[PDB]
Nucleic acid binder design. Structure first.
Ligand code: ZN
Ligand code: ZN
Lengths: 97, 643, 97
DNA sequence: TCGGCGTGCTC
DNA sequence: CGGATAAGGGCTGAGCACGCCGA
DNA sequence: CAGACTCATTTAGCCCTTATCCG
């Protein structure tokens, strides 16, 4: 069991690159600001999440993700060591509004 | 004629009054005189003349003359005038501060080395000879005091004994009463008004032989004063910091000089200025190091703190040493100059820390009382449940305090009682005695306390002294912090061990290679004092120069900077000021906000104190041209002990 | 919308450092191992995302974790603060198996 | 029409 | 039971008639 | 593991308030 759903705005600029295998790749950092529940007391939650989508055909949404009121990305998440990007996101499903 | 009358008013001017025919007054006589159309206040006559600035018919009359004899003696009056001129304070306030409270309203006035030192003091008699007694803690300072006092009393004179704190008065008055058949009397703010007046009257009459008290006992007149004794002259209690800010030691030295009587200053750790005067041949030193009665010196150790598994702020080596010492049925004392449970409360999510708006200071956490208390304005606040910024509930205590130490050493030591003493737990007079009673019972006990452990209390069953969180004295902006830390460390370490048991001292720090710590640990306090005095000689510091600080407090941080800039401009634009004078610009003090009011200061430096005094007098005469002098609280502090 | 679903074993023994005025907290590290597959190739998922449990309502389930056990923790993603910037990214557990 | 706040002076 | 006295606190260690401004 | 130089202790006005001892 490994899945994530996150809603937030984009940060910096959406980089789009083509892998040598022919699968387009888009990398961007998501800015999240929301309020959640913690021990029955409401508190705000915030984080910065780099998203590296590696879709080929279903990633057509990436052409219009630079500007968006609500950007939602869903799919697998896994982080790694960086000997400064430690927590990374490489989901596949992307939704706008 | 016209009589000059001083009143308790913050103005450096003496009012002039017309004496009705048939009444005569002298210097320093209380006179009931009207002041405006409000009430007939009480004033003190400074001098009598024949001419006044105002027309003679314009002056008012004096209702009644309380005393036909001056309340102050000639020497006391001269000292009061000299102090008023030196400290740039209004004469009326200075004069009335030296009077008893009941008289202010006009109520009816109504060893081989020890023998050598005593012989030298006796030989230097009937002359102004200032002596300094320096030695290891536990020496025969009291024995030398008793010897010199009995030698003085052999001629039938009187004596004055000064102590820094009220709590030390009983432990020495008991010995004085046991040794001396002559009556003795105390005088301090602890006593009632009637008792203080009785002490004043007995001192004036001359029936009382020895007067023991704090800095307020220096102004008491004596029928025939023979010697002045100052104990623990390096203490900061001798320097007043509210109202009239004088120094007891300097005034006592001036009194000895004017009256031509011996004065003895005794302290284990002499102040830097005293040692400078000794080097300048102004004082005469006497070293009575006699091992404090064949008592072995303590063993000093330095333990590195970096990269160690500290359990509640204690290193494993320190824990093992404490356990070993407690296993041998000996008490252990730990020094931590903190209070409360945690010095600050920190949010784990966003880093928010509770801060006092009126002080810009982090709140101190108390767990027993379960509230946040500010240590600068005594504000009371409850412990927050959620962070006011992010709303998280992950507030964690951070830092170390005596309360947390007492809480956390319980699991480590199963059957070792823990005793903690500080200001918080000593709010009652009986509370102190019972806690000291428990220590005197012997056995095994762990003592956690602040600098209250360095007072007159002596524990004969403590063998290990450990100092915790000594950082702050090595990275301080103040140049006197090292001296204060060294004095405190010497006082605390001097209590380690006893004549029979060998003491051990362990110091925990993150910088064991610092020259200050090495010099203070592997060498005596005298070597560090000499090195620091030489270093200050290389620079320009109050031990070798004169510093006067003009502090200003602003309710809105607006008028103080401009007022201090104008004062600096007046200081620089004066024929009295020379190039050698060094004046720093308006900068915030060490505490930019203490009671909701911003603080700014100006530092004046000059190699000669007389020239600086003349410049300050001229500027004060020229203050009247500065606008907006109101609504700003400013004071002059001569030779500050802080900043 | 910030919701994360994850499963795996425990890497570090849990800590029970309590907080003033109650509200205890649990400090432990979660170890997750799985694989990801999509069109074109397959991906690997492995790192050590920490999990934080706060409040006394969930205190009764934090027991018997020991050192290693297969558990699933649900919650949102929030960041922390330190002297090295973000310095970590903890998981606020809401539902525990 | 009446209370709160910013000035010299008191010999 | 009333007078005198000891212990503790809260702002302040100069203040009042006068004139001006906001409510 | 999360803050740096600090902190903390000390004596000495003044009017108003509260609690206690003595004749
Ligand atoms: Zn917070
Ligand atoms: Zn405060």
């Amino acid at each position: 069991t490994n899945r994530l759903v996150l809603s937030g705005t984009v940060c910096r600029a959406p980089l789009r690159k083509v892998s040598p295998s022919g699968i387009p790749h888009c990398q961007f950092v998501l800015e999240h600001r929301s309020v959640q529940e913690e021990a029955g007391f409401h508190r705000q939650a915030w984080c910065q999440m780099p998203v590296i989508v590696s879709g080929h055909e279903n990633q057509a949404i990436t052409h219009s993700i630079t500007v968006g009121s609500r950007i939602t990305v869903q799919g697998f998440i896994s982080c790694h060591k960086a000997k400064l990007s430690k927590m990374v996101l490489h989901a596949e499903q992307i939704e706008l509004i | 004629p016209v009589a000059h009358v001083a009143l308790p008013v913050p103005l450096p001017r003496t009012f002039d009054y017309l004496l009705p025919e048939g009444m005569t007054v002298k210097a320093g006589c209380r006179v009931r005189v009207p002041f405006g159309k409000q009430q007939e206040r009480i004033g003190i006559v400074v001098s009598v003349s024949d001419a006044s600035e105002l027309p003679l018919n314009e002056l008012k009359a004096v209702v009644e003359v309380l005393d036909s004899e001056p309340v102050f003696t000639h020497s006391v009056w001269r000292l009061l005038l000299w102090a008023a001129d030196y400290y740039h304070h209004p004469i009326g306030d200075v004069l009335f501060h030296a009077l008893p409270i009941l008289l202010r309203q006009g109520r009816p006035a109504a060893n081989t080395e020890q023998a050598t030192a005593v012989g030298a003091i006796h030989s230097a008699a009937d002359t102004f000879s200032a002596w300094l007694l320096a030695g290891v803690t536990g020496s025969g300072k009291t024995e030398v005091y008793l010897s010199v006092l009995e030698n003085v009393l052999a001629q039938g004179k009187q004596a004055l004994v000064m102590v820094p704190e009220i709590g030390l008065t009983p432990q020495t008055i008991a010995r004085f009463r046991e040794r001396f058949n002559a009556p003795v009397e105390v005088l301090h703010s602890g006593l009632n008004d009637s008792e203080r007046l009785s002490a004043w009257l007995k001192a004036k009459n001359g029936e009382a032989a020895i007067v023991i008290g704090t800095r307020s006992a220096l102004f008491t007149p004596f029928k025939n004063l023979g010697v002045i004794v100052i104990d623990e002259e390096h203490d900061s209690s001798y320097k007043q910091q509210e109202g009239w800010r004088y120094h007891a030691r300097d005034l006592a030295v001036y009194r000895a000089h004017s009256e031509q009587i011996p004065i003895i200053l005794g302290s284990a750790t002499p102040a830097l200025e005293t040692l400078c005067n000794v080097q300048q041949k102004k004082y005469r030193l006497l070293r009575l190091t006699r091992r404090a009665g064949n008592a072995r010196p303590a063993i000093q150790h330095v333990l590195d703190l970096k990269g160690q598994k500290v359990q509640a702020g204690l290193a494993p080596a320190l824990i093992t040493r404490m356990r070993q010492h407690l296993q041998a049925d000996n008490q252990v004392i730990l020094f931590l100059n903190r209070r409360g449970f945690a010095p600050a409360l920190l949010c784990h999510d966003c880093g928010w820390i509770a801060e006092c708006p009126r002080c810009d200071h982090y709140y101190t956490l108390h767990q027993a009382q379960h509230h946040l208390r500010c240590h600068h304005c005594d504000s009371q606040r409850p412990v927050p449940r959620q962070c006011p910024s992010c709303g998280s509930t992950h507030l964690v205590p951070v830092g170390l305090g005596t309360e947390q130490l007492e809480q956390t050493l319980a699991p480590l030591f199963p059957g070792v009682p823990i005793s903690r003493i500080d200001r918080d737990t000593t709010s009652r007079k009986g509370a102190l005695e019972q806690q000291l009673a428990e220590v005197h019972r012997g056995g095994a006990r762990i003592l956690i306390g602040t600098q209250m452990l360095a007072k007159g209390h002596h524990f004969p069953d403590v063998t290990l002294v450990a100092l915790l969180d000594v950082d702050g004295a090595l990275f301080s902006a103040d140049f006197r912090s090292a001296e204060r830390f060294a004095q405190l460390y010497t006082q605390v370490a001097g209590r380690a061990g006893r004549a029979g048991k060998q003491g051990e001292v362990v110091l925990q720090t993150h910088h064991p290679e610092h020259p200050l710590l090495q010099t203070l640990l592997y060498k005596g306090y005298d070597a560090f004092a000499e090195q620091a005095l030489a270093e200050r000689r290389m620079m320009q510091l109050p031990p070798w120069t004169s510093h006067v600080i003009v502090r200003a407090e602003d309710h809105n941080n607006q008028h103080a900077p401009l007022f201090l800039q104008q004062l600096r401009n007046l200081i620089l634009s004066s024929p009295l000021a020379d190039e050698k004078l060094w004046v720093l610009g308006p900068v915030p003090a060490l505490a930019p906000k203490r009671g909701g009011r911003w603080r700014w200061q100006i530092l004046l430096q000059h190699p000669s104190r007389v020239r600086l005094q003349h410049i300050i007098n001229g500027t004060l005469a020229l203050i009247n041209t500065i606008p907006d002098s109101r609504k700003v609280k400013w004071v002059l502090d001569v030779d500050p002990i802080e900043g």
